[PDB]
Design a protein around this ligand. Sequence first.
Ligand SMILES: CC(C)(COP(=O)(O)OP(=O)(O)OC[C@H]1O[C@@H](n2cnc3c(N)ncnc32)[C@H](O)[C@@H]1OP(=O)(O)O)[C@@H](O)C(=O)NCCC(=O)NCCS
Ligand SMILES: CC(C)(COP(=O)(O)OP(=O)(O)OC[C@H]1O[C@@H](n2cnc3c(N)ncnc32)[C@H](O)[C@@H]1OP(=O)(O)O)[C@@H](O)C(=O)NCCC(=O)NCCS
Lengths: 401, 401, 726
Amino acid sequence: EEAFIYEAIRTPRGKQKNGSLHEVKPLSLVVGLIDELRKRHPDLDENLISDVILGCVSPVGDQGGDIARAAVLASGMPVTSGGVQLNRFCASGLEAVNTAAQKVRSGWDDLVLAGGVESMSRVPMGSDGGAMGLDPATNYDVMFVPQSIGADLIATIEGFSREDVDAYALRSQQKAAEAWSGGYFAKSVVPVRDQNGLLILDHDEHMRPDTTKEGLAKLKPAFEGLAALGGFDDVALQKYHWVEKINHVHTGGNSSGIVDGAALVMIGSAAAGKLQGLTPRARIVATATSGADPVIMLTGPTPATRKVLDRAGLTVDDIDLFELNEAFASVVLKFQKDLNIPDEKLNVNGGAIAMGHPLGATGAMILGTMVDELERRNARRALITLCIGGGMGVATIIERV
Amino acid sequence: EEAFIYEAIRTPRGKQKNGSLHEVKPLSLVVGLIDELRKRHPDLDENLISDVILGCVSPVGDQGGDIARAAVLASGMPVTSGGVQLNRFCASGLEAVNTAAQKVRSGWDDLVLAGGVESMSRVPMGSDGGAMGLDPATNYDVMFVPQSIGADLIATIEGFSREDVDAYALRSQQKAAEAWSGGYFAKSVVPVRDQNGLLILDHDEHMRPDTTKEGLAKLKPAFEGLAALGGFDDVALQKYHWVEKINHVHTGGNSSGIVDGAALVMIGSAAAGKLQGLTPRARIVATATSGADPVIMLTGPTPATRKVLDRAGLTVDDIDLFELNEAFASVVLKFQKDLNIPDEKLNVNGGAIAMGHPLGATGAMILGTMVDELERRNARRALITLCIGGGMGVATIIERV
Amino acid sequence: GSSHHHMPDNTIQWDKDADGIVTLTMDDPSGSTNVMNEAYIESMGKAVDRLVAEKDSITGVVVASAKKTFFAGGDVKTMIQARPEDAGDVFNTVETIKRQLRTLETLGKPVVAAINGAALGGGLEIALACHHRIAADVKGSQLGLPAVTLGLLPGGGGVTRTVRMFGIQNAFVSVLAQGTRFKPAKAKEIGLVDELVATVEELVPAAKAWIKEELKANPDGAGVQPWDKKGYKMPGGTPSSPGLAAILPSFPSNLRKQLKGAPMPAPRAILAAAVEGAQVDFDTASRIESRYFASLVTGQVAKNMMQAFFFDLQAINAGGSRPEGIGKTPIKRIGVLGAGMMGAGIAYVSAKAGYEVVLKDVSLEAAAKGKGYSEKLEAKALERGRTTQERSDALLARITPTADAADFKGVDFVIEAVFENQELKHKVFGEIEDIVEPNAILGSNTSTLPITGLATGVKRQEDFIGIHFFSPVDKMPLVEIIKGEKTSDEALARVFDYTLAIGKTPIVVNDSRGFFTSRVIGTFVNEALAMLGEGVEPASIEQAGSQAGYPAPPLQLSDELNLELMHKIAVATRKGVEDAGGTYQPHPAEAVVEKMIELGRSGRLKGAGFYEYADGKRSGLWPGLRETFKSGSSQPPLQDMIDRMLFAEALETQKCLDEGVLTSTADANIGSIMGIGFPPWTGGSAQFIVGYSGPAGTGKAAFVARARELAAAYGDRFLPPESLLS
Ligand SMILES: CC(C)(COP(=O)(O)OP(=O)(O)OC[C@H]1O[C@@H](n2cnc3c(N)ncnc32)[C@H](O)[C@@H]1OP(=O)(O)O)[C@@H](O)C(=O)NCCC(=O)NCCS
Ligand SMILES: CC(C)(COP(=O)(O)OP(=O)(O)OC[C@H]1O[C@@H](n2cnc3c(N)ncnc32)[C@H](O)[C@@H]1OP(=O)(O)O)[C@@H](O)C(=O)NCCC(=O)NCCS
């Protein structure tokens, strides 16, 4: 009945340009994580694993053909373990865990393996196409603008200045460096190795721990040429007519990094753990799917968070840690201003601005980040949310057990 | 708690060569079905729709970018309705319904819209790539052979001759023609129209109702040149060493057709229906995911069926109707020989051999076919299963209410 | 049943020479231009059946015309009567037309289009179905697909073939999205026509010479279009190519950028059909093109634009508002008074039409700057857009600037464009009345001052007329002719001929407050200022203006039209109605214009208005607007703002029709489009009433229903007049 988390691991995130993980096919990233889960519980009867759910946003080329099923067969897992790829954009990682928890909760599945994988250096963004962007009738009607345009619009509506978003980007670099310095990630980050056991990557190489506040102010708005040539600024201001001009505040320093990575979470019922000698680390309390305006796109986290809090019957005061993916700095600042969340609760170990944002895997990565901090701080509850393309929202509440 | 089916509709299936649906983008196929569901219940508060789960096997080009989310926004549905694409190969349609039923059963979702969509004339098979086929190390290790090679191997192992599979292909054409003749599909097949309301397709045009037993015997094995040039015959006989030679018995007449189509199912809880004035048509009793040898690939239905029967606590005698997708004739004959199922229970309204096989949508199509025959015959239980690539298996048991 | 046919008359002459070349000569008996009517569809259907029936004895085809033009038109009377229930008949009709062209295109033999004159719309689509196009290099002949200007798309294969020829981007931006018309030399450069000849006599002989040359030097590829060959590569790639797909998401967004969010569906349908057509085969693309064409013809916007840009414009050019019975009197020399921005252009458009004009101003330095306005417009034409030639020197030789009033000796047409002061115009006309020839016409570019009182300054009041130009007259095509109480019909008859000679479209109005164009603009700008005083966000007001369809936002226009001059109109209309005994009820916008003047912000002239202005460029909105007018404390729906600015003008034009200012509804529609900037998709401010489409319904019934709803919430000025049956 109740869904518990038994394991939650992830790979280090290799950066886009001259990245260490570029030579690693994304199928190898997942099987390496399966190998690590097998090293921790060699006596686990893998035949009880009902399904393997992997989120992936660009399931083409190296990531096509149900890569979740490819991992099940390449890792020598039992053939009855299923395997399915899903895509709910950058919430695919958390949607896989929520679906796994809902599959466990239905009683028709006992032990599920959820996670995600994205190799953005190998499979670039938008490689899968899409009607929202490439079909004119669909694009013209829904008023499609890129997520970066909605980020600058958020800061324009809320009054977040360039210094305000660069102040959070600096904070993310610091807390991510402090998290790596204190060894918070030592047990959950599985270093990537080749077939010879030689090291490929053992840390989040996208991080710039020596970033200064003056160094961020010298960066240029990276999306100024996208809005002027594409005309997406005018499209966004037709929906938001009361806004006069877009303030372009996001740059390479205060936006999420394009990185490669993979994560894996083992979710099972209470009966499945006792039969396998597994100790539960946390319990999935509630999940929720909601959304908001697809033009601004990145405001989905706010209603999705309120919905998951109402289902669990809790308020903001009951949640000890808030983890929102740092796709853009203004999204986090907006999500904080809406729910009035203290800074000490929000992305305590840094986020995607410093460590990167592997689309399909991010939702499971930041979830495994919170199951560790809940166990480290010995706190009770945590809430995980991600901004989604098309204006969607996904929120999850976990409780340490 | 309990998951019920309130609506289950589908489009007619347009054939591959000179098909009527070729000019229809696959996003249009889904919104047209949403429009039909809105015509049946105009007073339904669509804000209670929690998610929209669409299975799709080649999510590229016209089907990329989470086409489920594109349908939610193009159909004018509320922005809180979510949307997610999944791929478990040709069971994606039924996996979406099972996931929807499991989402409803978890209590964290109230009203879910499951289904699938595939435009094989626009997005061909294998357009998404895949490691199992295109990565040599993965291909060489798992011993990948196409599904047609496993079909001929099934008939070789079980002794199904060319006449045996052509006898079932004839039976499928007949029962599909009788089903269309008797108007069994009148209420669940929504004809496709353009933006002007002009008709595009109103029937399954892949059907050949005037097929003769002598006409099928004149067809050539379509996969004889694939096995000789690709060497997949020798690969299959290394795993199945006791088999001496492959008997190539499948042709264009006894294999599933390449067609376009889309299906849509509305699943909700018992509380969601009474609050919306919806009458439940059937109840999802149990789902199950299992599998068998990925080389033979198409034997997944047998253990998946046994697992869903054990979970529901029923035997084969309790199921009134068995619906297995007719990807190849030998798969149905093998699934019948394993579970000893009478012919009068198995694919009573024809199947993919006559009406076609739209990969992502097939699982939801043959499910909606069984919710009608359960209501028409006034029978109680039905079991739906599909053979999956990579040797997977998915089975579902529905009960008329 | 689908064939080449859908008791007419034959419009195609058949001729096959000894070499096997068939010459299809288009020659519509009913009419002087080849028109895509029911006769053509039957004629071409018979012609292509005979080409298939005689394919053994035929080696090539030449499509020529017996008219002065090649082919341009279509039965617009049928397209505007197409109801949504006729979408099936529309689809089958356009499918039959393209089926005839597709058969002609795939005969296995070269077919050559001999374009002698204008090939517009269906005419170019016929030529695009050919394999080789030869155009006669003669000016006046155009080549284009201007279906977007009628709310339609080129349904006869225009979208599908231009995309296969040029690719999605170039075909849309250059050819399709704007209905651009090209000269034969220009069309050769882009690739519409393939070669040029000097004379139309050498056109058909060169067409047959190319056929023999094509069959000898390329027998295997003769009569095969590039998209019909294996391995055809679309220029710029298909939507699946990584190069095109990288910029394809910006094609609809830049379209919204140009349309500013206006509800014009034809440009969206053309872009949708073009991209969707490039993802499939040619024959499937043609069908997709037909379904979008049927979607527009049955729509209300296309009926508005066909009504205005075809029927209303043709009735005006036919001399509808011109008084019948009066002959034609010539124009010897034109005299322009005031070398300002308006007056400088009048000297240009007059000289561009071949009229020798003398431009007089106060000082000679002012007159030379007025002629410099024409030279600035000619630098962008002679050695920039390549539209002019060495003839523009003769254009500037017509303009003879001066400052002496005695230089008007022999001037037959006098147009004046001075400041809006009646006492000033009474003096400048009294100093010229005895100078110019006796039967000369006394025009007055006036936007407010009544012509009746303005005419008293001269003795020959019957030759005094109001000739209202719009700025810039080099680009604006409307001339508002205002009749004085004593204006003779022979006077405005000569003016009606003049406005047609300078390439403009005239409307005739009677002398009244604000005439027709100025009076209806005032209701537009005053509706926006009233909203600003109510607390509506000024950004929303500008968005509401541009998304309605107007070319310029209303607050931006309130700075071009000087905010001080608007206040002088407010005090002038009050004194006029008070001197008539009535009581004056002020408009809510007047308290807003008084606050902006009190704050020292009068518009672009002072350098500060609703926008801020630096270095002669319009910067953003003035930040002090939100605190001054409490903007934000009133948030009505954007559609209410759009309807307020559209209904106010529509209701006011109806009053002008009741008061007798306008004589025909065609002048109301065209006058609102080409002089007010009324949204073209509405088809005019009068067509807006009969073609209104909103939540309440469609037609005059829903208009007065929405007008009462606007009046019940925003003031009784939106209540419909009695002339609208209620
Ligand atoms: C963040 C983004 C601007 C990446 O830009 P980029 O140019 O590829 O990345 P770079 O790291 O090279 O940034 C550009 C410059 O900023 C500098 N920079 C970036 N972060 C910095 C930091 N923290 N401190 C100092 N300099 C920094 C780089 O050094 C570089 O300078 P250089 O070009 O001389 O080397 C943006 O393209 C992005 O990745 N957006 C996220 C997309 C997304 O969220 N997708 C989800 C929807 S599907
Ligand atoms: C079935 C399959 C052979 C299709 O072959 P095809 O050549 O594309 O299809 P056709 O219908 O043209 O069949 C070939 C011939 O058989 C004939 N034929 C097919 N079915 C027939 C029938 N029932 N009666 C008589 N003739 C028939 C056709 O008329 C044709 O003859 P023609 O070539 O002269 O027209 C096969 O390629 C297929 O579709 N497999 C299914 C793939 C699948 O299941 N994928 C799932 C895993 S991702």
